[PDB]
Amino acid sequence: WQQVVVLRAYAKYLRQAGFPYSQSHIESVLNENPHTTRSLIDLFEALFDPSQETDGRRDAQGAAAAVAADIDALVSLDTDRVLRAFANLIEATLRTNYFVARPDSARARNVLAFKLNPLVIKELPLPRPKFEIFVYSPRVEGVHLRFGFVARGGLRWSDRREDFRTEILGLVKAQAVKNAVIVPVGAKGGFVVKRPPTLTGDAAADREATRAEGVECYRLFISGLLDVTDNVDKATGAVVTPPEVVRRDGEDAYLVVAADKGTATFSDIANEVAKSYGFWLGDAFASGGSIGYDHKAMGITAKGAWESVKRHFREMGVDTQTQDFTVVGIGDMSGDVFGNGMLLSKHIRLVAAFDHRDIFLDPNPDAGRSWDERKRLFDLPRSSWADYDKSLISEGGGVYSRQQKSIPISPQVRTALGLDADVEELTPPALIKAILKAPVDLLWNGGIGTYIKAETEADADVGDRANDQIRVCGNQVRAKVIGEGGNLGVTALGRIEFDLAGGRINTDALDNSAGVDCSDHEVNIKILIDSAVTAGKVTPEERTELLLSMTDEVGELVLADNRDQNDLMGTSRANAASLLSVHARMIKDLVDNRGLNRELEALPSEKEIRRRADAGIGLTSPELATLMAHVKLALKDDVLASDLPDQEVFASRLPYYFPTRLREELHGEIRSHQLRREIITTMLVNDLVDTAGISYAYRITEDVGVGPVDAVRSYVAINAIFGIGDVWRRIRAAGDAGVPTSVTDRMTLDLRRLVDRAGRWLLNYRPQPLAVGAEINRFGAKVAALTPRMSEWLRGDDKAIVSKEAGDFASHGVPEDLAYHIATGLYQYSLLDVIDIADIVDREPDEVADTYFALMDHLGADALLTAVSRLSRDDRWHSLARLAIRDDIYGSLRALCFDVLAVGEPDENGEEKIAEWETTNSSRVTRARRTLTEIYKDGEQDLATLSVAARQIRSMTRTS
Amino acid sequence: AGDFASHGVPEDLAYHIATGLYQYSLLDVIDIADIVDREPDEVADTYFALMDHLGADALLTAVSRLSRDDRWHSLARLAIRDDIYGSLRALCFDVLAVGEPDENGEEKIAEWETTNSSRVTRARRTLTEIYKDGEQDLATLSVAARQIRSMTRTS
């Protein structure tokens, strides 16, 4: 009967995968081939019995050959397909708990677990997870799909027992997107109860048992999961395979659990269950519950979304922390998101707010008094909108109920929201839809569900029936800015329509990222401290003390991530129109190589793409966020597959993931973390994408012709050499001080062209692969010495244009040193050639810089490089052409500098060196200079004229 | 030479005419042999073997296909042809700076590429890809020429 249970479980997994033949047909096929069924059982038994490993050579070939010969013998088509599918499931099984006999396991409670490789299963619909575990029982049935070794996701208590694998596979892509910025990749679990209790008619004892049955089945599902999962022991540091479990895969120990629509109060139960198996993660197994973070207190999600709101309003030109602004909100002062976010400014004027229970209408809200009443409501353990003081409500305002037949409309309520002038009463559904379409500065979301749709998306396709009567369209939203603290509030196509209608919006995975981020952060700290507890440095009682002491510092680190995330979003929004073509090739690469789905990711179709190209606009803000999320995942996949996380130059940033107390006290424990390679890769990709830009790495690969690994090498070297991160923080501080986003954004765009050019230079002129430490130690110090002295050798047109850019920057409040430091970026790029040249001729870099920039002055090279930059980048070949001409100019600059430094004496300055090189030229150089000045006189700057000017410069050199 | 001789042209004269654009390269060959005080035979061997590995004849023919409608485009096509020839001179200088005279053109090229950098392997790969595209406007030919130019330290 136990072998029959195994076959039945395989059939249930087959049903979840969507096998065509039904269960009746499947059992009939197994019945009509009893010899073949016996052969299948023999193959499985040979595969997974630990005693077989004690029985000599495993009877692999015997059982496998019996199965294959029985497969061949089949004539009937349905039988043949069914038995190959069965054989494929046997082959695909990676682990099983059929043979574990220790009493605490789930096998003892009649639960069977199959860890499978979905990648090799023929009948599985796409996408195929990296690993899957299927749990079968007569009471419970669950699945867990993981796209990677280090994965995170929520556990759905699903009610789709017919196909929950379908639900889990549907939600795994969105969960993975949520995890773009965090160390792990997407995972998702889900269980259904198959023996719910009989109902007593008593509305109370029934829900109690229904709850307790779900608790027992939740326990069963997780226990079956841990019967096959490996454990981590810090006694030796190695990964242990469950005893009496035969593993066909490698080693796989990381597994954490997050709450979902049915797993809200089960985190604590999950922590107890993880402890019963003796799992190493302890309380990090489940995010929060009883040891971890009180997310309502921290309010990390609200501040993470407030960073996006502030960035959007800054692009709007407003500052929330000092200027009154009007808000329409979803939720009440008793939830985490709404309550924590609506107290973040004392200038908040909450004009309207509906709930699940009540409606709040403040026609002319105050700021100080409205904030005080909002704070009073938040401090209560529980409250509703009926608890708002109705004396602090503005005249014409009030607290009304959503269960009323209708709600009267005050003249003050009507004018503020802006509807047809005749309304004097509305229905609660229409009041909610009008709140949803409001001429309001901010639209704050702290609820759950979808309330904004696209004009093209069907109502049933959204998957939210409860709000289906109140859902408005994205193009129909009149809010200036939309802040997304909640999940699934707006559909992707709805987000695209809102951005396309003039609204400011990001994706929800980028706004509410903070709460999940804190979940991951908490996990990686609970790991680290548990390791240090095992090493005897932290007494178990001070572990909790240390955790609570670091709450604020952990929150600040997550908010720093959100701010870097949002600043990059604003900058990407700035550069959308001119990079649409580059962005389009990126999308194609992802589709062709990473198995991306254009329509699923809400990425534009190619007809949609040049539709916008014909309109002269780039990607929308939610689409830009989506693209950068996939870029972050692809970059993590690229860097992790390499030895970059292994090398020390990339590993020098590891301690900075952890708070100050741990950074100081825990140093050896940080260096020997379990997730060291993954944390380093995630930090790496976050820094790279936030600093270098969306198209940096892809353009590097397009231009240079290397793999992502070489691009990363180059970015790290340039950031460490030029202090690029430090310049970025100085730019961001100026923008935070009140400098408009246009000035700081343009500062950053010049800086990113500089890094592009500099990274390309390092890749092009130094041997590959890059030794990042070597190039840093032979360039970064020299660069730091040469950057502050840009004023001593800029001459003529160079000096004039640099002064103009620095003064324009400082005219908007930018500090003078930073304005000048930014204005000279394209000359800091030439300092790389300056340093390389000084190294070749073993002479000082000061004099080399003097000659290089004086020569850049005599011929007016700045105008030529600017004209080159004006060359079109519409397609890849023209971009290649403009890149070829810029590099030709720079290389010719290198050869002419070599010849000029080959004449004269170091005491001769740039002007004297140039004078006596031209004094020692040939007819070729005088003719070239005369033609160059004539070219400058024409003012024509197409490919041909600039190219002939470059040849004139090239012929000035013997080595040509 | 065979097309010329098919119409009755004498064979020596047909071949002598058919090789005119390589007789032009013999000027650079002689100048180069003079600079390195080595015999012109071996210099010619290396120069034309190198013109063989990279398919330079197709690139010069494509350059000749550039328009001469106005003075500036004619100047541009002249610029690209001279850039190709000067880059030929610099690469020939570097290859003759490696190896030994007894090594023929193929052996000289083999051991210079055997002693290149990541820059040269990447440049060759991009050049072969350019040859594969078959696009021969100003921009593609120019980027092919920059690939050839970056193969030289003195650049």
Residue numbers in the entry:
A (entry chain B): 629 to 1588
B (entry chain A): 1434 to 1588
Could you give the paper's own sentences about this structure?
The domains comprised in the 1–500 region of the protein are stabilized by crystal contacts in the crystallographic structure. Notably, the primary structures of ACT and PAS domains are poorly conserved and, therefore, these modules are often difficult to identify from BLAST searches. The C-terminal region consists of a single helical domain that showed no detectable structural similarity to previously characterized proteins in Dali17, ECOD18, CATH19, and VAST20 searches and, therefore, constitutes a possible new fold. Contacts between mL-GDH180 subunits engage the ACT*2, ACT*3, and C-terminal domains. The ACT* domains of mL-GDH180 differ from the archetypal ACT fold in that strand β1 is located in the position usually occupied by strand β4, creating an ACT-like ββαββα topology with a β1β2β4β3 antiparallel sheet. Notably, the interaction between ACT*3 modules in mL-GDH180 produces a continuous eight-stranded antiparallel β-sheet with helices on one side. Close to a dimer-like interface, the PAS module in mL-GDH180 adopts a typical fold, comprising a core five-stranded β-sheet usually involved in signal sensing, and displays up to 12% sequence identity with PAS domains in sensor histidine kinases retrieved in Dali17 searches. Similarly to S-GDHs50, the catalytic core of mL-GDH180 consists of subdomains SDI and SDII, with the active site located in a groove in-between. The SDI in mL-GDH180 contains most of the residues of the glutamate-binding region whereas the SDII conforms the dinucleotide-binding site.
